[PDB]
Amino acid sequence: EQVFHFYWLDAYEDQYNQPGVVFLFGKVWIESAETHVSCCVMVKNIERTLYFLPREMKIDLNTGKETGTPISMKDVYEEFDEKIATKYKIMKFKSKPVEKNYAFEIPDVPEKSEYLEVKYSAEMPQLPQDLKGETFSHVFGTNTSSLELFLMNRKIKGPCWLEVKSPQLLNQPVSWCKVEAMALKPDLVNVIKDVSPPPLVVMAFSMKTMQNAKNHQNEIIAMAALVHHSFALDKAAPKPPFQSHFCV
Amino acid sequence: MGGRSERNEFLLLHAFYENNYIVPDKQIFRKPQQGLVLDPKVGFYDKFILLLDFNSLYPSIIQEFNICFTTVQRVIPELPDPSLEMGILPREIRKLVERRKQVKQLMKQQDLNPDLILQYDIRQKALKLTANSMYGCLGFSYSRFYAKPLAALVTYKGREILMHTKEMVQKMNLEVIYGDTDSIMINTNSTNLEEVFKLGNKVKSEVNKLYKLLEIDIDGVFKSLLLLKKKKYAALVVEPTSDGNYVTKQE
Amino acid sequence: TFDPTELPELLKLYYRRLFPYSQYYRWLNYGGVIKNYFQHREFSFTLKDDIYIRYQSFNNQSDLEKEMQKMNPYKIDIGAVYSHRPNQHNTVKLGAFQAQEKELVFDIDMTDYDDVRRCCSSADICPKCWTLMTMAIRIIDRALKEDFGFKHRLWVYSGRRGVHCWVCDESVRKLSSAVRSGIVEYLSLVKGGQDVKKKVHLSEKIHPFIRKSINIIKKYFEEYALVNQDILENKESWDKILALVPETIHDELQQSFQKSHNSLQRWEHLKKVASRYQNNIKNDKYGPWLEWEIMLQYCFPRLDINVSKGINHLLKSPFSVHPKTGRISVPIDLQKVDQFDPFTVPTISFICRELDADYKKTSLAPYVKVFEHFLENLDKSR
Amino acid sequence: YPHCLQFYLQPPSENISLIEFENLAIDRVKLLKSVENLGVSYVKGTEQYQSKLESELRKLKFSYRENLEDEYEPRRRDHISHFILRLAYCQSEELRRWFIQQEMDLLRFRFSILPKDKIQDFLKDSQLQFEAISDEEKTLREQEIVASSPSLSGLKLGFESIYKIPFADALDLFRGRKVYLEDGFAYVPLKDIVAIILNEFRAKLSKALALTARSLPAVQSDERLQPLLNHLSH
Ligand SMILES: Nc1ncnc2c1ncn2[C@@H]1O[C@H](COP(=O)(O)OP(=O)(O)OP(=O)(O)O)[C@@H](O)[C@H]1O
Ligand SMILES: [Mn+2]
Ligand SMILES: [Mn+2]
Ligand SMILES: [Zn+2]
């Protein structure tokens, strides 16, 4: 099985153009050129995770008054998966029991209660943040951005060599990088530590704008930029700080 | 891109997630479109003046009094009972402090590659910056973890300890001319540089033994200073050279 | 002791059909006048292999029956009435779950009398030495009845080597830890451990509590000390008494003890010498200070301080079997406190035999009657 | 203002002129500093100390036995002055301790001034219950009181009044077995009674000063009281 690892530097996400997909850029070592080159991997199927805090006792949603029966976990599961599912058009969700702690400002929340963990693909619509239920007290994780989910779940701590298993090559290019890769699920990528950062390319640029003579519009006339292809990120700043430049 | 809040909030998110918490949902409105000060004794001081950097004061407060989201009982709050086990926020603040200390120890030992020495210095500086910005992460309206009672309590305790330090150093036969939670200018009435250094060391030691986790230090020395306002002064910065000699840089 | 291989079955039997669930609920609910009072009570269960759980609680009598039969806890203890349900202590904020109320509990152990005992030792007990507890009870009961005016006191046999006292007055249940410590200090006179040979010291003026304790002890001292133990039998016996006596008279005392023949005349002669031994040369004062110190040191009750100091400190429940002896914590009848006999206390095996051969059908009927009388007094006060 | 002694636990809600505010603050600071210096130089019980403090209080017109003038002016002056000094001193722990010490000395002095016949009502007016025993009861239980009494020499139970108090209020007192108890109520002499009174007053003052220290940031905004209250004593 082919696997490659690369030093990721930045990740890009959009909730409208490509919802549920996180693009992740960085430097990948290439043996053919025995160097490091730009690379971009897109991770799909980042499933929204929501936590339903259930009420200890069912209360009418119309008025909040007592109903007459306790609340069990299976009860809230059924209530959600029927009525909330139909209301907000969700066809597939993996509801599970979980036990999570809460110690923050949201009023009236048990510290260590039980929760219903609903994990469903981001393609389906997101529920409103103020959703209230007949059985469930209130839901958290409604609008947690996919990038945060990927970062927390995968235990990624800043730029660190990430190794991806089962890299599928997408048919059409999606970025300007030299190498591209695919990841069906966020769990397919793991974090490897015992490696040193690779040198990167640094370009320092400066340009001269000028207000248009007629009426208050900036106009760029001159550009200059210095380049350093192999810039160390742990050693001392290379001297000279550049090896090429261009102006126009 | 700027903003310590982002990095510190992500640190808190990692800490909570690794500890199995339900971190507060990211604010929906979002759209971020962006203590006590001692009245200064303005005047001319021809005697040596020394600066005590009150950096990492708020982190030290949090460590000392175990202020956390999991400890303080908000509903102005009340100090948590000391017997309670250390909270989360004090936990990783302590982790940062201990790793800074170990990096400092690594720096102490000699016979190290100068590049490695620079790397250790950079790591120590980064740890110091993160520790300093921890509180800013805690108390700020735009932040994810905005906890008004906790910020109010931390500021109150900081002001209390600063006032106590001022009165104590006054009792030490010295006089303090300015300080706001990040620096303290002390007039030594001493014309001997070594005497000033040892006096600064003694005041630092006594404040440290009064407050265990407070890490004060000497930032700079002014041979003569004209004070007019915050960041409004004219001084002869005392840059210490070798053999105890110093240069009076004009600042 | 008691065979543990048979403990589960018997315990099962016991915990199935001998625990007074109705009366237990009535007591621990104290009329059910406070909301969640029964629900907020902490219960502690020590199970097999000494593994014990804390912050256990229940909803009602039926829930207690169900859980207690399901587990059959080997030992049951009661705790304090917390702010919330102890069972959900985890789901409460750190520091917001704090003990709020508990009954005032005193604990007396017989091991503390090892320095003051000759016949039996450790948990071993015989009718000769049990009188100590009797006297102790009397004193403490009087001290609680008169000096402090606590009306609802339930005295229970610890089971093996001492006794327990529960004070359940509505005001008493609200006392803080400091007030409990002060009460323990007031009701305690024997100060000092084995390191100090002389463990009792009396001031010039005798406190009315001390005077009344002396008066009570004078009634039972002769029977307990002068015949059953023969503390003045010979040199090997009266040397201990002499040790805590001034040396200036020791010789004479020894001579008299050598010239005496029994404990009574030695008591009389020691009284005479003390009335003629000038404790302080300045004054001509003579007193039984040596005699009264001997009496109190040999008889005055000793209390477990740390047990009562804590608000959340747990104590064995009444009608609970003792794992290391199989004895059941049975209320001790005050009116028959002198006639009470720990050996006649019907063991779990004995009550089971009486059963396997309603509570009124067994020998728990009188103990349950004393308990129900205490509960009836509690209800009457309401 | 029912009584001259009073416990300060009800902040006033009147309106006073700025000049009156400043005068009250300065007068009370002067009184407290005089109390401190007079206690340091002399002994706290000598008739000289009491007479000198009497003269100081008369010249500062801060307190006096009940009369037409006392009803209105000295008592309100004492009240508002004490609360202004509360605002001034709650800034630092050292200031709090100093204020507590000197206020305790002043309260002890004022208690010593107070005639015995009125103490009862003061205890009733203090909003906490202390009850005085009857002469018949005192005669009946004189032997018990003497036996439980502290190292106080002799059986002489003089004219000092004896009071019936719950054992809870005498924790530190009855914990040492130096007092007589009956049905949960303790019998105590005058000196121990004043000790208990000052201890409870100290607890109340400490709590109030902590609360005012917390509340300061709201009130420090005013500009015409910052220069006065910041350095009222310093
Ligand atoms: N290590 C301990 N842990 C928890 N509770 C204890 C411990 N030691 C003592 N206790 C409690 O304090 C009491 C004092 O010890 P002790 O066993 O002598 O009391 P007792 O019940 O009168 O003795 P016994 O059960 O032999 O009749 C115990 O009964 C028990 O209720
Ligand atoms: Mn016991
Ligand atoms: Mn014990
Ligand atoms: Zn025996």
mmCIF file of N, CA, C and O in Angstrom, chain C residues 185 188-207 209-210 214 243-246 279 288-298 300 302, chain D residues 176-177:
data_model
loop_
_atom_site.group_PDB
_atom_site.id
_atom_site.type_symbol
_atom_site.label_atom_id
_atom_site.label_comp_id
_atom_site.label_asym_id
_atom_site.label_seq_id
_atom_site.Cartn_x
_atom_site.Cartn_y
_atom_site.Cartn_z
ATOM 1 N N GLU C 185 -14.718 18.487 73.128
ATOM 2 C CA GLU C 185 -13.772 18.973 74.127
ATOM 3 C C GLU C 185 -14.431 19.087 75.495
ATOM 4 O O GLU C 185 -13.843 18.700 76.511
ATOM 5 N N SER C 188 -14.969 15.694 77.253
ATOM 6 C CA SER C 188 -13.742 14.913 77.336
ATOM 7 C C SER C 188 -12.872 15.453 78.462
ATOM 8 O O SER C 188 -12.654 16.666 78.555
ATOM 9 N N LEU C 189 -12.378 14.553 79.310
ATOM 10 C CA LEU C 189 -11.493 14.915 80.410
ATOM 11 C C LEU C 189 -10.183 14.144 80.415
ATOM 12 O O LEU C 189 -9.163 14.699 80.827
ATOM 13 N N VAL C 190 -10.179 12.890 79.975
ATOM 14 C CA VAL C 190 -8.963 12.083 79.950
ATOM 15 C C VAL C 190 -8.119 12.540 78.765
ATOM 16 O O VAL C 190 -8.403 12.187 77.618
ATOM 17 N N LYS C 191 -7.078 13.320 79.040
ATOM 18 C CA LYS C 191 -6.213 13.873 78.010
ATOM 19 C C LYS C 191 -4.839 13.220 78.083
ATOM 20 O O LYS C 191 -4.319 12.949 79.168
ATOM 21 N N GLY C 192 -4.261 12.972 76.920
ATOM 22 C CA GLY C 192 -2.944 12.378 76.834
ATOM 23 C C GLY C 192 -3.002 10.905 76.473
ATOM 24 O O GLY C 192 -3.967 10.196 76.778
ATOM 25 N N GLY C 193 -1.949 10.436 75.810
ATOM 26 C CA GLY C 193 -1.860 9.063 75.362
ATOM 27 C C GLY C 193 -0.947 8.223 76.230
ATOM 28 O O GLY C 193 -0.625 8.571 77.369
ATOM 29 N N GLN C 194 -0.519 7.090 75.667
ATOM 30 C CA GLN C 194 0.340 6.165 76.397
ATOM 31 C C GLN C 194 1.670 6.796 76.785
ATOM 32 O O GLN C 194 2.285 6.363 77.765
ATOM 33 N N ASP C 195 2.128 7.805 76.040
ATOM 34 C CA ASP C 195 3.420 8.413 76.341
ATOM 35 C C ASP C 195 3.443 8.997 77.747
ATOM 36 O O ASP C 195 4.473 8.954 78.429
ATOM 37 N N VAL C 196 2.320 9.543 78.200
ATOM 38 C CA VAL C 196 2.225 10.149 79.522
ATOM 39 C C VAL C 196 1.634 9.135 80.489
ATOM 40 O O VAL C 196 0.527 8.625 80.283
ATOM 41 N N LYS C 197 2.381 8.840 81.554
ATOM 42 C CA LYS C 197 1.914 7.896 82.563
ATOM 43 C C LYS C 197 0.669 8.419 83.272
ATOM 44 O O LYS C 197 -0.293 7.675 83.493
ATOM 45 N N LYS C 198 0.670 9.700 83.634
ATOM 46 C CA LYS C 198 -0.472 10.315 84.303
ATOM 47 C C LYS C 198 -1.346 10.984 83.250
ATOM 48 O O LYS C 198 -1.018 12.068 82.756
ATOM 49 N N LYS C 199 -2.462 10.342 82.908
ATOM 50 C CA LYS C 199 -3.308 10.776 81.805
ATOM 51 C C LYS C 199 -4.460 11.671 82.243
ATOM 52 O O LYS C 199 -5.276 12.056 81.402
ATOM 53 N N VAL C 200 -4.555 12.007 83.528
ATOM 54 C CA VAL C 200 -5.636 12.839 84.043
ATOM 55 C C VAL C 200 -5.044 13.879 84.984
ATOM 56 O O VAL C 200 -4.201 13.552 85.826
ATOM 57 N N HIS C 201 -5.486 15.126 84.838
ATOM 58 C CA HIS C 201 -5.068 16.217 85.709
ATOM 59 C C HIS C 201 -6.274 17.101 85.986
ATOM 60 O O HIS C 201 -6.973 17.507 85.053
ATOM 61 N N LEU C 202 -6.513 17.397 87.261
ATOM 62 C CA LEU C 202 -7.670 18.168 87.687
ATOM 63 C C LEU C 202 -7.230 19.520 88.228
ATOM 64 O O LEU C 202 -6.236 19.616 88.956
ATOM 65 N N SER C 203 -7.975 20.562 87.870
ATOM 66 C CA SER C 203 -7.709 21.897 88.380
ATOM 67 C C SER C 203 -8.153 21.994 89.839
ATOM 68 O O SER C 203 -8.785 21.089 90.391
ATOM 69 N N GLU C 204 -7.811 23.117 90.475
ATOM 70 C CA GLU C 204 -8.165 23.300 91.880
ATOM 71 C C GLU C 204 -9.675 23.268 92.076
ATOM 72 O O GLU C 204 -10.173 22.628 93.010
ATOM 73 N N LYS C 205 -10.419 23.950 91.211
ATOM 74 C CA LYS C 205 -11.872 23.957 91.284
ATOM 75 C C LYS C 205 -12.435 22.837 90.420
ATOM 76 O O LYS C 205 -11.981 22.615 89.294
ATOM 77 N N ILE C 206 -13.428 22.134 90.955
ATOM 78 C CA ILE C 206 -14.032 20.983 90.293
ATOM 79 C C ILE C 206 -15.246 21.470 89.517
ATOM 80 O O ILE C 206 -16.185 22.026 90.100
ATOM 81 N N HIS C 207 -15.225 21.261 88.206
ATOM 82 C CA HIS C 207 -16.338 21.676 87.368
ATOM 83 C C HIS C 207 -17.588 20.881 87.744
ATOM 84 O O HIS C 207 -17.493 19.685 88.043
ATOM 85 N N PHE C 209 -19.799 19.591 85.942
ATOM 86 C CA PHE C 209 -19.753 18.382 85.130
ATOM 87 C C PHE C 209 -18.815 17.356 85.753
ATOM 88 O O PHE C 209 -19.166 16.177 85.883
ATOM 89 N N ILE C 210 -17.630 17.797 86.177
ATOM 90 C CA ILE C 210 -16.674 16.886 86.799
ATOM 91 C C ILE C 210 -17.206 16.389 88.137
ATOM 92 O O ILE C 210 -17.052 15.214 88.482
ATOM 93 N N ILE C 214 -17.955 12.553 89.086
ATOM 94 C CA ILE C 214 -17.392 11.929 90.280
ATOM 95 C C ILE C 214 -18.490 11.277 91.106
ATOM 96 O O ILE C 214 -18.332 10.158 91.607
ATOM 97 N N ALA C 243 2.239 4.038 90.518
ATOM 98 C CA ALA C 243 3.009 4.775 89.520
ATOM 99 C C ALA C 243 2.503 6.202 89.363
ATOM 100 O O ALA C 243 3.297 7.143 89.257
ATOM 101 N N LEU C 244 1.182 6.389 89.366
ATOM 102 C CA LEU C 244 0.577 7.707 89.222
ATOM 103 C C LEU C 244 0.297 8.357 90.572
ATOM 104 O O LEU C 244 -0.672 9.110 90.714
ATOM 105 N N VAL C 245 1.131 8.072 91.567
ATOM 106 C CA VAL C 245 1.000 8.645 92.905
ATOM 107 C C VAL C 245 2.346 9.263 93.270
ATOM 108 O O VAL C 245 3.390 8.752 92.839
ATOM 109 N N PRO C 246 2.383 10.350 94.044
ATOM 110 C CA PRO C 246 3.679 10.938 94.406
ATOM 111 C C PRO C 246 4.563 9.941 95.139
ATOM 112 O O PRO C 246 4.094 9.147 95.957
ATOM 113 N N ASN C 279 -0.626 18.114 99.410
ATOM 114 C CA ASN C 279 -0.334 18.264 97.988
ATOM 115 C C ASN C 279 0.485 19.522 97.727
ATOM 116 O O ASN C 279 1.507 19.474 97.031
ATOM 117 N N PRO C 288 -9.039 14.176 97.666
ATOM 118 C CA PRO C 288 -8.879 12.904 96.955
ATOM 119 C C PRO C 288 -8.287 13.093 95.569
ATOM 120 O O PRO C 288 -8.309 12.164 94.758
ATOM 121 N N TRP C 289 -7.752 14.288 95.291
ATOM 122 C CA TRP C 289 -7.223 14.582 93.960
ATOM 123 C C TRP C 289 -6.443 13.404 93.400
ATOM 124 O O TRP C 289 -6.605 13.048 92.231
ATOM 125 N N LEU C 290 -5.614 12.763 94.224
ATOM 126 C CA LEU C 290 -5.027 11.498 93.800
ATOM 127 C C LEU C 290 -6.095 10.416 93.685
ATOM 128 O O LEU C 290 -6.154 9.700 92.681
ATOM 129 N N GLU C 291 -6.966 10.304 94.690
ATOM 130 C CA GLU C 291 -8.027 9.300 94.651
ATOM 131 C C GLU C 291 -8.995 9.562 93.503
ATOM 132 O O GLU C 291 -9.354 8.647 92.752
ATOM 133 N N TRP C 292 -9.445 10.809 93.361
ATOM 134 C CA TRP C 292 -10.403 11.131 92.310
ATOM 135 C C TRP C 292 -9.760 11.038 90.932
ATOM 136 O O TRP C 292 -10.416 10.640 89.965
ATOM 137 N N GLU C 293 -8.480 11.400 90.819
ATOM 138 C CA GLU C 293 -7.774 11.206 89.558
ATOM 139 C C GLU C 293 -7.687 9.727 89.216
ATOM 140 O O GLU C 293 -7.891 9.334 88.065
ATOM 141 N N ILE C 294 -7.397 8.886 90.211
ATOM 142 C CA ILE C 294 -7.380 7.445 89.979
ATOM 143 C C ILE C 294 -8.740 6.985 89.478
ATOM 144 O O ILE C 294 -8.846 6.265 88.479
ATOM 145 N N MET C 295 -9.804 7.404 90.164
ATOM 146 C CA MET C 295 -11.143 6.957 89.794
ATOM 147 C C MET C 295 -11.498 7.385 88.376
ATOM 148 O O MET C 295 -11.932 6.562 87.562
ATOM 149 N N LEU C 296 -11.318 8.669 88.059
ATOM 150 C CA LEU C 296 -11.671 9.154 86.728
ATOM 151 C C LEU C 296 -10.800 8.512 85.654
ATOM 152 O O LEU C 296 -11.302 8.102 84.603
ATOM 153 N N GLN C 297 -9.493 8.405 85.901
ATOM 154 C CA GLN C 297 -8.596 7.821 84.912
ATOM 155 C C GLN C 297 -8.953 6.365 84.650
ATOM 156 O O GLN C 297 -8.865 5.892 83.510
ATOM 157 N N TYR C 298 -9.356 5.639 85.690
ATOM 158 C CA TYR C 298 -9.722 4.240 85.554
ATOM 159 C C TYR C 298 -11.138 4.048 85.029
ATOM 160 O O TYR C 298 -11.471 2.943 84.584
ATOM 161 N N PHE C 300 -13.331 7.204 83.685
ATOM 162 C CA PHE C 300 -13.931 8.272 82.900
ATOM 163 C C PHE C 300 -13.960 7.885 81.421
ATOM 164 O O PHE C 300 -12.989 7.311 80.912
ATOM 165 N N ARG C 302 -13.696 7.791 77.355
ATOM 166 C CA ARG C 302 -12.818 8.347 76.335
ATOM 167 C C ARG C 302 -13.537 8.288 74.994
ATOM 168 O O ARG C 302 -14.191 7.288 74.683
ATOM 169 N N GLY D 176 -13.478 25.097 76.334
ATOM 170 C CA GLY D 176 -12.460 24.818 77.322
ATOM 171 C C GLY D 176 -12.977 24.355 78.664
ATOM 172 O O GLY D 176 -12.175 24.153 79.581
ATOM 173 N N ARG D 177 -14.290 24.182 78.815
ATOM 174 C CA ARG D 177 -14.880 23.721 80.071
ATOM 175 C C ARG D 177 -14.712 24.750 81.182
ATOM 176 O O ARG D 177 -14.547 24.396 82.352
#
